[PDB]
Amino acid sequence: EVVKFMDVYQRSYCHPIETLVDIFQEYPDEIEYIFKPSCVPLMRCGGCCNDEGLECVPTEESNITMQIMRIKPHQGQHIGEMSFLQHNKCECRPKK
Amino acid sequence: HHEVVKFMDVYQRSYCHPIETLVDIFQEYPDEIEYIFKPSCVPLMRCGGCCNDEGLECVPTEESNITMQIMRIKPHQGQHIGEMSFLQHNKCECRPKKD
Amino acid sequence: DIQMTQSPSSLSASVGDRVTITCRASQFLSSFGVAWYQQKPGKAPKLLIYGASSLYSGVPSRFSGSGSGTDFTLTISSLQPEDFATYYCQQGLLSPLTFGQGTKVEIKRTVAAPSVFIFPPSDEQLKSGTASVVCLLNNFYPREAKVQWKVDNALQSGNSQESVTEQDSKDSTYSLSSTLTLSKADYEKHKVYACEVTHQGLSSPVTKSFNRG
Amino acid sequence: DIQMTQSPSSLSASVGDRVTITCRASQFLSSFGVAWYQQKPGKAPKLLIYGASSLYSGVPSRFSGSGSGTDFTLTISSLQPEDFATYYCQQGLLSPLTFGQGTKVEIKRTVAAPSVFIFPPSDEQLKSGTASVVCLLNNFYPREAKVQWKVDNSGNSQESVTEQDSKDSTYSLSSTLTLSKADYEKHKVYACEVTHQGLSSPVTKSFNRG
Amino acid sequence: EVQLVESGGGLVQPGGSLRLSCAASGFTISDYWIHWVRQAPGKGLEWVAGITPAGGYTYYADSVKGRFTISADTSKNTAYLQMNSLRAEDTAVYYCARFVFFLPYAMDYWGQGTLVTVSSASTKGPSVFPLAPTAALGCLVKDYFPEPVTVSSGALTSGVHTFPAVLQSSGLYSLSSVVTVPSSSLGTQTYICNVNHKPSNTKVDK
Amino acid sequence: EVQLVESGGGLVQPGGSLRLSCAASGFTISDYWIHWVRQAPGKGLEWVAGITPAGGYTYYADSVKGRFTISADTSKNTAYLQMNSLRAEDTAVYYCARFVFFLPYAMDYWGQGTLVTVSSASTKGPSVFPLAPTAALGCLVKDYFPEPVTVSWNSGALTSGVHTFPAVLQSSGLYSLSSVVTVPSSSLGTQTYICNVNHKPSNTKVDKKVE
Numbered sequence A: 001e002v003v004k005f006m007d008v009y010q011r012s013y014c015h016p017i018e019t020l021v022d023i024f025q026e027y028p029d030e031i032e033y034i035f036k037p038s039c040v041p042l043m044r045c046g047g048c049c050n051d052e053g054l055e056c057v058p059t060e061e062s063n064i065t066m067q068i069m070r071i072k073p074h075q076g077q078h079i080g081e082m083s084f085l086q087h088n089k090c091e092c093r094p095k096k
Numbered sequence B: 001h002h003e004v005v006k007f008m009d010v011y012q013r014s015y016c017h018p019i020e021t022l023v024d025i026f027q028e029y030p031d032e033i034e035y036i037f038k039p040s041c042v043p044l045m046r047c048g049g050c051c052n053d054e055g056l057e058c059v060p061t062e063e064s065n066i067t068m069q070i071m072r073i074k075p076h077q078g079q080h081i082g083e084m085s086f087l088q089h090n091k092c093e094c095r096p097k098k099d
Numbered sequence C: 001d002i003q004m005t006q007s008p009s010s011l012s013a014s015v016g017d018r019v020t021i022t023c024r025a026s027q028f029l030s031s032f033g034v035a036w037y038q039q040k041p042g043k044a045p046k047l048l049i050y051g052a053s054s055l056y057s058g059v060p061s062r063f064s065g066s067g068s069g070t071d072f073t074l075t076i077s078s079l080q081p082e083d084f085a086t087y088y089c090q091q092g093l094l095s096p097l098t099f100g101q102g103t104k105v106e107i108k109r110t111v112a113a114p115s116v117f118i119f120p121p122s123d124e125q126l127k128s129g130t131a132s133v134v135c136l137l138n139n140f141y142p143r144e145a146k147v148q149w150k151v152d153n154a155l156q157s158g159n160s161q162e163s164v165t166e167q168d169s170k171d172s173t174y175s176l177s178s179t180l181t182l183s184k185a186d187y188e189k190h191k192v193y194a195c196e197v198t199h200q201g202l203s204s205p206v207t208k209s210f211n212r213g
Numbered sequence D: 001d002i003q004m005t006q007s008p009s010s011l012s013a014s015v016g017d018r019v020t021i022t023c024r025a026s027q028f029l030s031s032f033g034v035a036w037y038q039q040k041p042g043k044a045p046k047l048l049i050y051g052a053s054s055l056y057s058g059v060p061s062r063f064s065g066s067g068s069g070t071d072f073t074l075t076i077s078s079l080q081p082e083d084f085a086t087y088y089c090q091q092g093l094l095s096p097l098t099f100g101q102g103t104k105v106e107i108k109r110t111v112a113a114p115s116v117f118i119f120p121p122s123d124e125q126l127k128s129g130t131a132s133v134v135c136l137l138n139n140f141y142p143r144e145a146k147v148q149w150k151v152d153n154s155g156n157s158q159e160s161v162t163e164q165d166s167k168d169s170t171y172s173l174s175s176t177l178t179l180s181k182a183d184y185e186k187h188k189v190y191a192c193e194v195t196h197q198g199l200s201s202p203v204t205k206s207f208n209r210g
Numbered sequence E: 001e002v003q004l005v006e007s008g009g010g011l012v013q014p015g016g017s018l019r020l021s022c023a024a025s026g027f028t029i030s031d032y033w034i035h036w037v038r039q040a041p042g043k044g045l046e047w048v049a050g051i052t053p054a055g056g057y058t059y060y061a062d063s064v065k066g067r068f069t070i071s072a073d074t075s076k077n078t079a080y081l082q083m084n085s086l087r088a089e090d091t092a093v094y095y096c097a098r099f100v101f102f103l104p105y106a107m108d109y110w111g112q113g114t115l116v117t118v119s120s121a122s123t124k125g126p127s128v129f130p131l132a133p134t135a136a137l138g139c140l141v142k143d144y145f146p147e148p149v150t151v152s153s154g155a156l157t158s159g160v161h162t163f164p165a166v167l168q169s170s171g172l173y174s175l176s177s178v179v180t181v182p183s184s185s186l187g188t189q190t191y192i193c194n195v196n197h198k199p200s201n202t203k204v205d206k
Numbered sequence F: 001e002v003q004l005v006e007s008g009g010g011l012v013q014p015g016g017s018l019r020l021s022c023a024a025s026g027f028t029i030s031d032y033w034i035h036w037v038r039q040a041p042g043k044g045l046e047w048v049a050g051i052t053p054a055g056g057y058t059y060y061a062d063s064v065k066g067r068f069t070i071s072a073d074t075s076k077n078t079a080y081l082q083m084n085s086l087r088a089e090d091t092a093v094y095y096c097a098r099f100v101f102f103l104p105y106a107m108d109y110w111g112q113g114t115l116v117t118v119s120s121a122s123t124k125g126p127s128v129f130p131l132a133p134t135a136a137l138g139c140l141v142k143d144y145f146p147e148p149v150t151v152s153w154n155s156g157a158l159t160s161g162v163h164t165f166p167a168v169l170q171s172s173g174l175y176s177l178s179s180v181v182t183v184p185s186s187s188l189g190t191q192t193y194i195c196n197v198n199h200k201p202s203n204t205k206v207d208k209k210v211e
Helices: A005-012 B007-014 C123-128 C184-188 D123-128 D181-185
Strands: A015-022 A034-036 A039-046 A054-072 A076-094 B017-024 B036-038 B041-048 B056-074 B078-096 C004-007 C010-014 C019-029 C034-039 C046-050 C063-076 C085-091 C103-108 C115-119 C130-140 C146-151 C160-164 C174-183 C193-198 C206-210 D004-007 D010-014 D019-029 D034-039 D046-050 D063-076 D085-091 D103-108 D115-119 D130-140 D146-151 D158-161 D171-180 D190-195 D203-207 E003-007 E010-012 E018-025 E033-039 E045-051 E058-060 E068-073 E078-083 E092-100 E106-110 E114-118 E127-131 E135-144 E160-162 E173-181 F003-007 F010-012 F018-025 F033-039 F045-051 F058-060 F068-073 F078-083 F092-100 F106-110 F114-118 F127-131 F135-144 F150-153 F162-164 F175-183 F193-198 F207-210
Touching: A005 B041, A005 B056, A015 A076, A015 B017, A039 A054, A039 B007, A054 B007, B017 B078, B041 B056, C004 C085, C010 C019, C019 C034, C019 C085, C019 C103, C034 C063, C034 F106, C046 C063, C046 F106, C063 C085, C085 F045, C115 C193, C115 C206, C115 F135, C123 C130, C123 C184, C123 F127, C130 C146, C130 C184, C130 C193, C130 F135, C130 F175, C146 C160, C146 C174, C160 F175, C174 C184, C174 F175, D004 D085, D010 D019, D019 D034, D019 D085, D019 D103, D034 D063, D034 E106, D046 D063, D046 E106, D063 D085, D085 E045, D115 D190, D115 D203, D115 E135, D123 D130, D123 E127, D130 D146, D130 D181, D130 D190, D130 E135, D130 E173, D146 D171, D171 D181, D171 E173, E003 E092, E003 E106, E018 E033, E018 E092, E018 E114, E033 E068, E033 E106, E045 E068, E045 E092, E078 E092, F003 F092, F003 F106, F018 F033, F018 F092, F018 F114, F033 F068, F045 F068, F045 F092, F078 F092, F127 F207, F135 F193, F135 F207, F150 F175, F175 F193
Parallel strands: A039 A076, B041 B078, C010 C103, D010 D103, E010 E114, F010 F114
Antiparallel strands: A015 A039, A034 A054, A054 A076, B017 B041, B036 B056, B056 B078, C004 C019, C019 C063, C034 C046, C034 C085, C085 C103, C115 C130, C130 C174, C146 C193, C160 C174, C193 C206, D004 D019, D019 D063, D034 D046, D034 D085, D085 D103, D115 D130, D130 D171, D146 D190, D158 D171, D190 D203, E003 E018, E018 E078, E033 E045, E033 E092, E045 E058, E068 E078, E092 E106, E092 E114, E127 E135, E135 E173, E160 E173, F003 F018, F018 F078, F033 F045, F033 F092, F045 F058, F068 F078, F092 F106, F092 F114, F127 F135, F135 F175, F150 F193, F162 F175, F193 F207
């Protein structure tokens, strides 16, 4: 079945969407450690705007805590609690 | 302000799978020089997530196509709704990295 | 299901020798998902190598592991008597996790003849109405040996059972026990209980005997 | 709701003159969501400028648009008689889409005097029991003018003014006073006194019978 | 030729319902978003309804939000504006306009407009009287309701001045149409005015 | 010191149920995945159960899938393997092993193992007879069921020279084994030789002095 134009328009237009974010990307200072899982599901601004003069950006944020296996390769491991940023509300705003 | 996400729950939910991804049309069709699109991007099922091994990567093992009505625009001249086809990933696997 | 096939099934060599066990995968693998373990008889397996090439802490340096794709190997640079064990490879990444068939490592050594011993049935057992005459063949090599029971110079058949010890972790020898089982009635009918031992390290057979019964 | 405020609320200039309408936004707007429209009396608006500066096909070159952020402008480099209209700006990006208050553009020409005419109530209407006496003030600039009515040398001065002409920039005005057949029969001399800048002395148009 | 043609306007009692049609031709209505814009007598332009670019759903003006509904019939190449629970403040000329992307967020083609009159008053046909005398002559279109009237056939062209309607204390409208003509043609040429008031289906010629 | 200690094994009737416990010490089990591995008599290693890295779901071997369930009691720092609808092919030594990530996908610490015997046959205690005489002396541990027997010499202070033979299955369907030790003839008087036989299934603890 063909996806109707208005349905595609509404579904792709800039909004908070579950995104698979790499932990090391969010915490680039934890070089020595490796995480299990290596990435987490987070609500982040995604999608598109009306035109090229606009960008999709967060206007309301919060945090989420997750139990992550923290690994010191060849030495040890333990479950720790890690905090991550979530985007609750998004807006199309004039490009920076 | 929610409860803490339990390790096994995060593990299962983030592990390699087809996930709705917001893909730019011009990225999928880079040869377009005539038109601009509305919406500029589409929601597609694509492989996402992690394999928690350096020797592994998350890849599609079953694919299909989806057809969407997209506004095809010739700037300052005209517009019309057309039908555009896109690739979708139906099944994903963690497979030994392409050395 | 990924299949792990080891070769050879059994690998026999001398002390000081460099030996290599091969594990072949049914499909291309990630090297981090390959591990090796050693298991001594009636004992829990012990970790040797993880991630195809990483040597586990406390494991001797004579052990090493290598490979990629479908072929993985485990090398013992200088085989030792204590290295007598069954070695298994395991893939722990893809489901289901699976172990190889196993490779039995045996030690070749010089021929050693068995020290033979005969034990008469105890008083306690005789009161119960059964007689167990046991014969011990101690610390020999190779494991092939023959035990013949002669009761009053006649060969005995179907009335004995034998059991062999696993290769020794220090001297690489075997030991075997052969048990002749008879009713008190049959044991009372005869005088001489002879144990005849034949082995490569023996030029002439050795006999161990006793009277009474 | 973004507010669009135009300035001035209504202007007046000469043919050949450069005029500029300003639209001020209540918040920053990216200059691609701003449109300018022209509206002739009792007619649907027509698109002039889109994306703050893009001139729509077939619109005269005298029309131009500019600005960014909160201040947007529309310029008519050489005002023409046909340019008599109400001009609106519109923001079409952020919800809800909104139009400005409007700017009325009026044209200025040389002073011209109104040709005055008086019309008596018809026979047909008199049979119905009502009398409508109308006065026409034809082709005059400027639009400010006074009409006075006196019976035998009062009120009901329901006047209507035509919209400025698109070719000659001149206005026309009709003044109508309504009376019952009974009241109309009570008098004889019906006069309409016209006062304008074009005339040095007032002009009167009259009739007898009633 | 691209055209938007409106219909379904006229007189409505307070608390009534009315459906305005917007018929497209020269293009496919599904390739665009049709917006509704209203102009109250003497007042400026008010944006009423339409699918909006920031999100993709149908927005409405706060005064009409909750009583108005837009829709479209793809086979009939026509958009609609259903207006219910009508009130005095809804008395206006209603336009439908083609909201476009190729001229970003602009309305390039508009409907001719249609007047919606929210009144408890009844429809009243107009009385036509002559305004008898270069000479000036005309017609007086008196006592009618609701607006509008259309006055003339091809003779009335130059010198014609059809005045805006005035509201008498009656709650009824009155109009005048005049034409300046040369005095010589007062005999040789006949001058007659043709009027039409669609609400009362009146087509009186004089 | 990290340790895994198993319990709950022994004899079970066909179609029975048995729960194996795996007790951790020296670490927290919640920080790890505990896997179960088994070895059938004479056969190689078979991976039975565990939470798996590819997906995080728990897997079982096809033969045990549908009758086995793993679990853990966080307060007791203990993992469990509940085995139901037991069959002959489930007769094996069962191990629990610490599946680790810091030594990727490796089992670094293992339980001592426990034998599960799926049989309709009854428990039978062993008869202990001496094997009286460098000299050789021993013990004959006759007629017992099921396996195993634990033989030690002089409360485990005597180890050099000990040879505890693999058990043989007699026609009666009962096991029999021998334990021998070679000792110097001088120590035949000065030192006392006693074997410590223990057969946990019948809770038999025979201690026998030899000539």
